[PDB]
Design a protein around this ligand. Structure first.
Ligand SMILES: CCCCCCCC/C=C\CCCCCCCC(=O)OC[C@H](COP(=O)(O)OCC[N+](C)(C)C)OC(=O)CCCCCCC/C=C\CCCCCCCC
Ligand SMILES: CCCCCCCC/C=C\CCCCCCCC(=O)OC[C@H](COP(=O)(O)OCC[N+](C)(C)C)OC(=O)CCCCCCC/C=C\CCCCCCCC
Ligand SMILES: CCCCCCCC/C=C\CCCCCCCC(=O)OC[C@H](COP(=O)(O)OCC[N+](C)(C)C)OC(=O)CCCCCCC/C=C\CCCCCCCC
Ligand SMILES: CCCCCCCC/C=C\CCCCCCCC(=O)OC[C@H](COP(=O)(O)OCC[N+](C)(C)C)OC(=O)CCCCCCC/C=C\CCCCCCCC
Ligand SMILES: CCCCCCCC/C=C\CCCCCCCC(=O)OC[C@H](COP(=O)(O)OCC[N+](C)(C)C)OC(=O)CCCCCCC/C=C\CCCCCCCC
Ligand SMILES: CCCCCCCC/C=C\CCCCCCCC(=O)OC[C@H](COP(=O)(O)OCC[N+](C)(C)C)OC(=O)CCCCCCC/C=C\CCCCCCCC
Ligand SMILES: CCCCCCCC/C=C\CCCCCCCC(=O)OC[C@H](COP(=O)(O)OCC[N+](C)(C)C)OC(=O)CCCCCCC/C=C\CCCCCCCC
Ligand SMILES: CCCCCCCC/C=C\CCCCCCCC(=O)OC[C@H](COP(=O)(O)OCC[N+](C)(C)C)OC(=O)CCCCCCC/C=C\CCCCCCCC
Ligand SMILES: CCCCCCCC/C=C\CCCCCCCC(=O)OC[C@H](COP(=O)(O)OC[C@H](N)C(=O)O)OC(=O)CCCCCCC/C=C\CCCCCCCC
Ligand SMILES: CCCCCCCC/C=C\CCCCCCCC(=O)OC[C@H](COP(=O)(O)OC[C@H](N)C(=O)O)OC(=O)CCCCCCC/C=C\CCCCCCCC
Ligand SMILES: CCCCCCCC/C=C\CCCCCCCC(=O)OC[C@H](COP(=O)(O)OC[C@H](N)C(=O)O)OC(=O)CCCCCCC/C=C\CCCCCCCC
Lengths: 198, 198
């Protein structure tokens, strides 16, 4: 009823919008005329001059690129040679800093890893002794704990059920009048709500 | 009242748990103490064993490290000389290259910049010519644009009044009875809600 009237004004609004779109597009397209023509007047010489600018620019850039290429050739090539020789020298350096050092590092390893062998081997063995004692303690105390847990759990399970029995009975006992009372509230609610929603 | 009944059952559980927590923490403290007693008994032993054994361990690694460092320093000396004399040549060759290749690069740069300067000069002026033409077109185009857009704005405002007046009064005209229906429903709905609450 109300929405129907709302739509009426909406229709008029849409109709008036169409009446707007008319002159709007007429002038818009006409605006686009000057827009495209103006841009054409701009871009015509802009593009023609663009070529007349890019031509000498690419020409100048090519020349500069050639100079840079020559620069790179007259630099990178001899530089690579210098760096190659320098690297070769550094390689010789590295060879003297890798061969006598690497072989020494391996000897150091003999006095490190192999030395640690006779250090960690007894250590792990002693660790096993410590582990055995600790594990046995954890087994003695653990077994006792298992019994303790079993006992405490039994005392808990029994009391839990001893409370679950009356709790469940009371819960169900209360649920009866409670659900009924709530049902009464739901029934009245449903009936009252349906009246307002009609 | 239901919240209070439940709360009372929570107080009792928390109290029972606390009363049990007493012997629980006591038994735990006792057990933990016995565990730590052994742990400390073994800790002192382990610590002493580790300390006594760490002596030859650290002593050995100390001697090893000393020899390692001595050889490292005894080698780093000539190695530093290699790097020094090597770098001296590497840098000398680079310096004797940085001068000619640097000056030649600057010479090329002179041409690079010169050719660019003599190009950018007319280029920027030609760009100014473009800007003058572009902005000029934008003046004629923009002038018509703003005028046309303004004209369409006036028409939009006139047709906006065709909404700001009729449609707005229509909206308010609908809002009045709508508010009535809303008041009747919402006001009574609040009553309905309270009916089930309390
Ligand atoms: C100064 C003047 C001289 C210039 C020096 C030369 C530099 C330029 C040369 C090479 C650069 C290569 C960079 C590596 C990039 C890839 C990394 C990566 O993706 O790696 C993953 C692979 C996986 O394993 P894979 O079996 O599939 O690959 C090996 C199998 N294949 C080789 C058959 C393909 O792992 C590997 O390649 C791991 C291989 C371990 C590499 C050992 C290096 C041995 C050589 C020298 C010792 C270095 C001393 C350092 C001195 C300091 C200088 C500042
Ligand atoms: C499902 C449940 C299972 C649990 C799984 C266990 C996994 C956890 C494992 C590793 C993480 C390490 C964390 C355990 C210890 C943290 C205790 C803690 O929360 O520390 C922080 C509290 C904060 O207080 P504060 O220090 O800032 O204040 C006092 C201020 N005043 C001193 C500074 C001035 O400090 C205190 O509580 C005081 C300090 C207490 C120090 C305890 C460290 C004891 C060390 C070794 C015991 C060995 C155990 C070996 C295990 C094998 C058993 C067979
Ligand atoms: C205030 C905040 C505190 C929160 C406290 C709440 C705690 C509530 C208590 C326990 C939580 C876990 C309960 C779940 C155990 C079910 C036992 C049961 O009903 O088993 C019979 C089922 C029969 O087969 P089905 O096809 O029906 O089941 C397949 C199940 N479906 C259909 C999903 C595929 O068999 C099975 O599930 C297979 C047997 C699995 C046996 C597991 C024994 C593990 C033992 C020790 C680990 C300790 C866990 C600690 C928790 C308990 C402390 C007392
Ligand atoms: C009052 C004492 C009650 C004892 C009776 C059994 C009822 C359980 C009761 C309380 C414990 C509560 C917590 C249970 C948690 C998960 C329950 C569940 O849903 O568990 C099945 C799932 C499914 O994975 P799955 O079982 O295929 O993989 C495991 C096998 N895979 C890896 C080893 C080869 O496992 C998981 O969540 C992972 C945990 C699997 C634990 C298995 C332990 C089974 C222990 C005993 C069975 C026989 C009891 C008979 C003797 C007692 C008579 C009173
Ligand atoms: C059928 C139904 C099933 C039954 C349900 C079973 C599930 C258990 C459920 C509930 C437990 C009861 C609720 C807790 C009671 C409250 C105790 C208490 O008074 O609470 C508060 C304290 C302090 O808190 P606050 O500083 O903010 O207050 C200070 C106050 N103000 C802010 C004013 C300064 O909180 C504390 O004491 C909390 C300490 C921090 C949390 C520690 C958790 C440790 C858990 C495991 C460790 C494992 C031990 C075993 C393994 C060995 C490891 C070595
Ligand atoms: C046989 C003998 C065996 C002995 C070993 C047995 C087991 C270990 C047990 C006990 C030993 C622990 C005690 C020694 C630790 C050092 C504590 C310490 O002296 O403490 C403070 C220092 C300094 O303080 P500062 O340098 O900051 O200040 C600089 C300050 N300015 C410049 C102003 C001056 O700090 C430090 O020594 C920094 C070390 C602590 C920070 C570690 C890094 C933490 C961050 C990230 C962890 C990684 C996460 C990523 C996930 C991993 C995935 C695998
Ligand atoms: C053909 C018909 C032609 C006729 C129409 C005429 C053309 C309209 C032309 C021009 C209108 C521009 C007017 C506004 C100019 C002022 C701009 C300005 O000065 O700005 C700055 C102010 C900041 O203030 P402050 O620095 O003092 O404060 C800062 C204080 N604090 C940070 C510290 C705490 O910022 C602000 O005012 C922020 C304002 C943000 C409001 C945006 C509203 C957008 C509207 C609709 C959404 C539609 C998007 C289009 C998509 C359509 C899809 C269908
Ligand atoms: C047995 C029965 C049991 C009972 C159970 C109870 C459960 C319900 C529990 C909690 C509900 C939340 C209650 C919030 C109470 C306060 C409401 C209020 O007075 O709040 C307004 C404030 C004002 O804002 P302010 O401080 O920034 O501005 C002023 C800035 N000064 C002061 C600096 C100038 O709000 C703010 O602070 C934050 C803004 C967030 C709210 C925006 C809403 C704006 C209005 C309309 C848009 C939404 C329409 C609804 C569409 C949804 C349909 C589903
Ligand atoms: C933060 C960044 C730092 C840069 C780090 C670079 C390190 C790279 C690592 C290792 C060396 C790699 C050395 C590579 C040498 C090979 C160069 C070459 O010809 O490359 C060809 C490519 C061609 O790509 P395409 O995509 O066209 O074709 C590939 C194909 N379509 C595909 O999908 O796979 O060209 C390109 O990718 C782009 C053009 C490049 C032109 C060359 C331009 C080089 C010019 C001059 C030399 C370098 C200057 C040295 C200065 C010293 C002088 C003083
Ligand atoms: C105050 C409120 C009190 C009630 C409160 C209830 C609360 C419940 C609890 C929680 C809120 C739950 C909120 C749930 C929201 C979402 C519910 C939902 O699942 O919606 C989706 C369905 C889906 O329809 P589609 O079936 O066509 O196809 C399924 C879909 N593609 C898919 O993949 O699932 O659409 C439908 O429901 C179509 C139903 C068509 C039946 C006919 C419906 C038409 C019924 C009556 C019309 C009578 C005519 C009246 C006018 C008379 C004059 C002409
Ligand atoms: C069922 C309908 C029945 C019809 C009912 C009609 C009646 C409507 C009644 C009233 C209209 C309200 C008209 C409100 C106009 C603006 C009112 C205004 O300026 O309010 C001020 C607030 C300021 O909040 P602040 O939190 O900033 O508080 C001020 C600040 N703290 C201080 O100290 O100074 O600004 C805001 O919160 C922003 C307002 C956001 C609300 C708009 C939100 C716009 C939401 C949606 C519009 C987008 C539509 C998208 C559709 C897409 C679908 C296809």
């Amino acid at each position: 009823l109300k929405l129907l009237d709302n739509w009426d004004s909406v229709t008029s609004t849409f109709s008036k919008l169409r009446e707007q779109l008319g002159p709007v597009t007429q002038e818009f397209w006409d605006n686009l005329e000057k827009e495209t023509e103006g841009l054409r007047q701009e871009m015509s010489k802009d593009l023609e001059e663009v070529k007349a600018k890019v031509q000498p620019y690419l020409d100048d850039f090519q020349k500069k690129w050639q100079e840079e290429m020559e620069l790179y050739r007259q630099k990178v090539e001899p530089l690579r040679a210098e760096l190659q020789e320098g690297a070769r020298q550094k390689l010789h350096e590295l060879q003297e800093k890798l061969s006598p050092l690497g072989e020494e590092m391996r000897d150091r390893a003999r006095a490190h890893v192999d030395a640690l062998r006779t250090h960690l081997a007894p250590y792990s063995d002693e660790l096993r002794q410590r582990l055995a004692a600790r594990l046995e303690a954890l087994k003695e105390n653990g077994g006792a704990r298992l019994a303790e847990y079993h006992a405490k759990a039994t005392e808990h399970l029994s009391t839990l059920s001893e409370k679950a029995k009356p709790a469940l009975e009371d819960l169900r006992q209360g649920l009866l009048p409670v659900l009924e009372s709530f049902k009464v509230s739901f029934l009245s609610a449903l009936e009252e709500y349906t009246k307002k929603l009609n």
